[PDB]
Design a protein around this ligand. Structure first.
Ligand SMILES: Cc1ncc(COP(=O)(O)O)c(CN[C@@H](CCC(=O)O)C(=O)O)c1O
Ligand SMILES: Cc1ncc(COP(=O)(O)O)c(CN[C@@H](CCC(=O)O)C(=O)O)c1O
Ligand SMILES: Cc1ncc(COP(=O)(O)O)c(CN[C@@H](CCC(=O)O)C(=O)O)c1O
Ligand SMILES: Cc1ncc(COP(=O)(O)O)c(CN[C@@H](CCC(=O)O)C(=O)O)c1O
Lengths: 359, 359, 364, 364
C-alpha cells in the first residue's frame, strides 16, 4: 500500500458486525459477559480497552510501521506515560529546545519523583554520548523542534541509544507519520501530539504512542490502565476521521511552505527564517535523509516586538492562536511562528507579504 | 437551593452568548485572540481550559460545596494527579480495602517514584494516628469501600489529618455528592470516579476533583495542565447531562437497596450481607452521622464459587459487567457484588430472589 | 412481565450484541459493506433506510407504547408530516380545535396544497367528531391533553369512532408520554411524540417518534420515511435512548411537584383560572383519569393581564423563560389570551418550585 | 477575493465569536433563554427554527455556491422534498429522465398525491425541455451529471428556459460539488446537494443542503423547513462543516485518479463503454467543460454481463461494495443494465486504485 492508500485502509476502521465503513463511536463504559470472564470480543471495561480507541491505536501503529498503538487524552499525557517507564534515580536526555510543556512536566513534576533530567544540544550527536550517565535510561528527541526547527539525527541517536542501552523516544508531532517514521530508523518509541496534524481540524486534544517492542508496549498498556490518561471514544473517532485526509493536507501545506519561505527570505523586514528546507539550515541534509517532506511550522524574525504585533493585525487569513497543524493557518509569537494551513497558496503568500509590507 | 434544585441549576450549565439552556460542546482545540494575550472569554488552549470542561468542573465544585473543580479523563487519572501533589520520599496512608486500581497505581507506579505507601485498617481511627511517619504527607480514604463497604470516620480522619499536617483526600464515588460531602467535614480534597454514579448511564469514563483550598487547586491545575489527563468536551457534556438526574436516580436506587437487603438477610442461601445500612455493620452509626443516604453497591456471600456462577445465569435483569452506579443493575464476583440500578424495585427483588432459590 | 421502570431500562434493544456494550454504539456512518452483492451482514445497507443507533430508539418507543414498529424522525413536526403523508389528494383529516401551533401551521399552510382538507373540531365532545366526518374523511388526529389549555379528549371513544367510520386514528402523546398514557392499547392506530419534550427530557434533542402495531401502516410509514428522508441522526438517536432511561423517575418527580404547584395556584388571589387535567372541575377530568394513570407537567393559568404576566416571569428564579417543555429545568412562557401563562414543571425540588412561583405571583 | 481553497476554510462563519474558538461549537440544545419576553440574546429561540451549529453549515454552503441563504436538512431527500413543497396542487415539475432513484420514488409515489404531476425529460437536448413545458409547469429540476450514466445537461440554457417560461430552476449539484460547478452563478434559482456524498466526504453524515440568492424563495424555504421539521442535527451539522474543510484537496485528488482510471478503462478489453463527462466522445462533453472546471469522481462502465460484474467486485481490494458515494474510501456498486458497474473514486493512491481495478478486470 502506498502512503495515500494506507491512510484510508490502514488499521481497523470499519465494523465487522454491521459492515459500517466507519468506526462506531462506542460511548460506553462496560460490556456484557456471556460467562464469568468470557469476553464476547475482548472488551470488559472502557478504560482498559474501548473499540473506538482500539481503532485509532491500530491506525497510528500502522502509519508508523509499529506493532502496538496507544491513544491518550493529550500529547502531554502520552509523554507522561512514556516518562513513567523509568524509576526513581533514572536519568533522561532531551534536546535543549524541547517544547515548553515537556520542559515543565519533566523539570517541575518528574524531578519531584527522583527522575533527573538534562537538556542537551542534540544537533551535534557528540553531545549525546558524553552526557550518558550510568543511571541514564532514556533518550527523548523532537525533530524538528519548537519553535526554531532544530534537526536532530534520528538514526545516529538510535544507534547511540542502542549501544548505551537507552529507550529511544522521538516526538514526531511536527513531521507526522506521513513524512517521518522514527521506528523505521531504529527508535524504540514514537509519540505524537495528535492535537496538531493528525486531527488536523483544531477540534481534538489527544496523544498517540506507537512501538514495535512487545515489552515497552506491555509496560505502556499497564501505565495507561494504571494512570487512566486514556482518550475518549468521541475524540478517538474524530482523530480517525481527520487522519484520513492527512496525506492530502500535508501535501497542500508543503506546497505553500515552499512559496511562503521564498517570500520570507526576500523580504527586507524579515531576518532569520528558520525551517529545515533552507539550505543554510543546520543539519539540513540530515533532515532530508530521514524525511521525505517538510513541516508546516515556520519561524522568522522581525525587527522587534512591536513589528510582530503589527504584522499579526494586518493579516487576514492567519489566525492568532496557540496550536499548530490546523486546516486554518495559525500565527503566534513564542520572533514570529506560523503554522501553514491548507488555504490557497497564493492567498497565504500574498496575505503575509502585504502584512510585512506595512512594517 | 435544596438538593434536587442544586443538581439542575448548580454551577454554570448554560450559554450566556446564545441563551442555550445546555452547555455547548466545544469540540475545539484553540481560541482566537483579539490582541496578543487578550483572551476573549479567558480561553487560549483547550488542554489548559475548555468551556465544556469548565462547566462540569463548576458543577462538581457546587455539589460538593467546594470552590474549584477539576475534570479528568478517568477516576484513576483524578487519583493520579492527587498523588502527584507529593514529592520523592513522602508517605501516604490509605485504607486497607482500597479499590484495586488505586492499589495498583500506588504500589506499582508511584512506589517507583519514591512515594512510600502503607495500607491501614482505617475503620479504627487509632490505627491512623500510629502509622503517621515524619514523612507522612497524605491521608486517602474511601468510604464505603470496595467491595465490602467498610465505613471510615471522615470527620475524625479530617481532624487527624489537620493535627498532623496531612492533605486529607476522600474517594466519594460510592456515596456521590447527593448523600455525602467530605469537604463539609473538614476534608481537603474530594474526588469521584465519574464513570459510576455521576454519569449514571454507563457511557462516560471520567474523574472529578473538588476542593475549597486555593493552594491545592493551584497545584492541581498545574498538574492537570502539565500531565494532560484532561476530560474531553463530549464526555464533559454527557457528565453534566447525567448529573442532572443524580438525585432522582439515587433515591430510586436507595428504595430498592432497602428491599433487596431485607430479601438477602432472610434467604437461606445467602450468608454475610455487607452494606452500611445493616445495624450489625461495623461503623454503621458513623456512616449515618456523615451521610443522609446509602450507596447502591451491595455485597453478599453464597456457598461457594459455583453457586455464584449459577446465581448470575439465573438472573434476568442483572447485567454481568465490571462497573457500578448504572441505570441498569450490574453483578460481578470480585462473594457476589451487585450495583443496584433504577429498575422497578419489586422486579429487582424478585429477580434476585428466584435466582437464589435455584441454589 | 416487566414493570414500567424496568421496561425503561431493558425495553427494546439498547445494547451491542457484538462487543457486549451495555449502551447502543453511535453508528456515525452512512453506508455498509456487503460481503456478497445483496448480502447484508446485519441487515444494513444505507443509514437513511436503516441505522443501528436509530433502530435502537425505534425499538424503544415501540416497546414503551406496546407497539410493533417504531420510527424516529428529525423532529416532532417531521413525525407529524410523515403521518399526514399517509393520505392522498382529496382526503380529509379531523383534528382537535386547539392543536399545537406548528401542526395547525403545517396542515393549513402546507398540506392544504397536498389536496388534504383539514377540519378542526372540539373533540372534547365526541359528538362533534361524528358530526364532522365527511365522506372523504380518512384520518383522525387528536392531542390529549392539548396545548396550552390541556383539553382532554376521550381516546377510547375516538378510536371506536375512527374504526366505525374507517378512519386512521392518530394520537399525539407528547404531553402524557408512554409512562402514563398508551393510546395503542386503547385501539389507536398510530401514536406519535415530540421527543424534544419529555422522552429526551434534557432539552438537548429535537426529534420525533412514531409507533404502531399495524403492519400495513408501518410499511407505508417506512416507505415515506425513506422516500422523504426526515430521519433522525445517530447522535440524536443515542441521546434520545439515554434520556428515556430516566423517564419514569423524571415524570414521577414532575407529577409530585405538579400536585403542590396546582394547590398553590388555586389559592393565590392573583391567579384566576388554572388549566390541568388533574383538577376535579376540569372538563373530561374523569375521562383522563380512566385513560391515563398520571399527569403531564405542563400547567396553564391566568393572571390579571399581560403586564402581570411579564412581571411574574422576571420575578422567578428557577423558571427559564424559553420555548419547548418537558426538560429537567422548569420552563415558563406566555402563549389563548394575554394573561395566559404556561409552565413546564421540571425536576427541581418541589418546595423550591412552589415557593419560587408563589413569591413571584405575590409581587403582582 | 478569496480563492476556492481559502474559501473552504474561512467561508461563512465557522468560529465562536464568544470564546474565540476556531471551530463551530456543537449546540446540543433545544431552546434558548430570553432575557425579556421576545428579546433574543443572539437571535435563537428554538433549535428547530434556528440552531447556531446548523446556521454555521448553512452559511458555508451559501458562500461556497455564491448564494445568500443556506438551509441544512436531515438528508438529501429531505432537501428535495422541501424544494418540491414550493409548489401547489396541480403544479407541474420537469425532471431529467435519469434522475436519482430516490427522487423518482419521491416524485412518483408521494408527491403525485400532493397534486404535483411530474414529467421526466431527456434534458440533454434542451429542445425536449421546451416541448414539455405545460401551462401548469412551475419548476425545472435537473441532475448534471446524472446517476449512474452521468448525462450532462446545459445548465445555462436550462436557466434561460426556466426564466423565459417563469419556472423555478433547481439543480442537484451533488456529483459536481460547489468546488467545480456553481449553478447559482449560471442563473439557477435553487441549488441543492446530498451532503452525504462529497461535502461530508467521510461517509459518516446523512444530510441535505440547499442554497439560493432569491429572498422570496428563501423565506418560503425557511417556512417549509420549520413547518415540516426535516432539519439537520447539531452533531451532523458540525461534522458536515468539518468535512467541507478538506473538500478541495479531496476533489483534486479524486480528479487525478479519475483521469488515470478512465484511461485504464478505455484500454481494457473486458470493458466496453465508459460513461464520464471528461471523455471527449461523451454527449455534451463541451457543455460540461464550459459550465464546470472539474469532474466528479463517479464513473460508470460496462462489463460483459452480470457474472463478470460480480466476479470483478470480489477481485478488488480497495473498492468497498456498498451504497453511497463521494467518500474518502473508494466504493463500487452495480445499479441501467446488468453489466453496468458504478465506482466512486476515493482519495487512495492513484497508482493503487488503477492497479487494483486493472488486475480485477483482468480475472474476467
Ligand atoms: C511538539 C509538541 N509536543 C507536545 C505538545 C503538547 O501536546 P498536547 O496535545 O497539546 O497536550 C505539543 C503541542 N504544543 C502546542 C500547544 C502549546 C500550548 O498550549 O502552550 C503548541 O506548541 O502550539 C507539541 O507541539
Ligand atoms: C471507588 C473507585 N475509585 C476509583 C475507580 C476507578 O475510576 P475509573 O473511572 O474507572 O478510572 C473506581 C471504578 N472501579 C470500577 C472498575 C473496576 C475495573 O474496571 O477493574 C469498579 O469498581 O467496578 C471506583 O469504584
Ligand atoms: C404537542 C406537540 N406536538 C408537536 C410539537 C413539535 O415537535 P418538535 O419536536 O418541537 O418539532 C410540540 C412542541 N411544541 C413546542 C415548540 C414550540 C415552538 O417551536 O415554537 C412548544 O409548544 O413549546 C408539541 O408540544
Ligand atoms: C444525486 C443524488 N441526489 C440525492 C441523493 C440522496 O440524498 P441522501 O443524502 O442519500 O438522502 C443521492 C444519494 N444517492 C445514493 C444513495 C443510494 C440509496 O440510498 O439507495 C446513491 O445513489 O448511492 C444522490 O446521489
Amino acid at each position: 500500500m502506498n502512503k495515500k492508500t494506507k491512510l484510508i485502509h490502514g488499521g481497523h476502521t470499519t465494523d465487522d458486525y454491521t459492515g459500517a465503513v466507519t468506526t462506531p463511536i462506542y460511548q460506553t463504559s462496560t460490556y456484557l459477559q456471556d460467562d464469568i470472564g468470557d469476553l464476547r470480543q475482548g472488551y470488559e471495561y472502557s478504560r482498559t480497552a474501548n473499540p473506538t480507541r482500539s481503532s485509532v491505536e491500530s491506525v497510528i501503529a500502522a502509519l508508523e510501521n509499529g506493532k502496538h498503538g496507544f491513544a491518550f487524552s493529550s500529547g502531554v499525557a502520552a509523554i507522561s506515560a512514556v516518562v513513567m517507564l523509568l524509576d526513581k534515580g533514572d536519568h533522561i536526555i532531551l534536546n535543549s529546545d524541547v517544547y515548553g510543556g515537556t520542559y515543565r512536566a519533566l523539570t517541575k513534576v518528574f524531578t519531584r519523583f527522583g527522575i533527573e533530567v538534562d537538556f542537551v544540544d542534540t544537533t551535534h550527536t557528540d553531545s549525546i554520548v558524553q552526557a550518558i550517565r550510568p543511571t541514564t535510561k532514556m533518550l527523548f528527541i523532537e525533530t524538528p523542534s519548537n519553535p526554531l526547527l532544530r534537526v536532530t539525527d534520528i538514526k545516529k541517536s538510535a544507534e547511540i541509544a542502542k549501544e548505551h542501552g537507552l529507550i529511544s523516544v522521538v516526538d514526531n508531532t511536527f513531521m507526522t507519520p506521513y513524512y517521518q517514521n522514527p521506528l523505521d530508523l531504529g527508535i524504540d518509541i514514537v509519540l505524537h501530539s495528535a492535537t496538531a496534524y493528525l486531527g488536523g481540524h483544531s477540534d481534538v486534544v489527544a496523544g498517540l504512542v506507537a512501538t514495535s517492542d512487545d515489552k515497552l508496549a506491555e509496560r505502556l498498556a499497564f501505565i495507561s490502565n494504571s494512570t487512566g490518561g486514556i482518550l475518549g471514544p468521541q475524540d478517538s473517532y474524530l482523530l480517525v476521521r481527520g487522519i484520513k485526509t492527512l496525506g492530502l493536507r500535508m501535501e497542500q501545506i508543503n506546497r505553500s511552505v515552499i512559496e511562503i519561505i521564498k517570500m520570507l527570505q526576500a523580504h527586507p523586514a524579515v531576518q532569520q527564517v528558520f525551517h529545515p528546507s533552507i539550505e543554510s539550515h543546520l543539519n539540513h541534509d540530515v533532515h532530508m535523509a530521514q524525511a521525505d517532506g517538510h513541516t508546516g511550522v515556520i519561524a522568522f524574525e522581525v525587527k522587534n516586538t512591536e513589528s510582530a504585533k503589527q504584522l499579526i493585525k494586518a493579516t487576514s487569513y492567519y489566525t492568532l492562536a496557540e496550536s499548530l497543524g490546523a486546516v486554518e493557518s495559525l500565527i503566534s509569537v513564542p520572533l514570529v511562528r506560523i503554522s501553514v494551513g491548507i488555504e490557497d497558496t497564493e492567498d497565504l503568500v500574498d496575505d503575509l507579504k502585504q502584512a510585512l509590507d506595512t512594517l
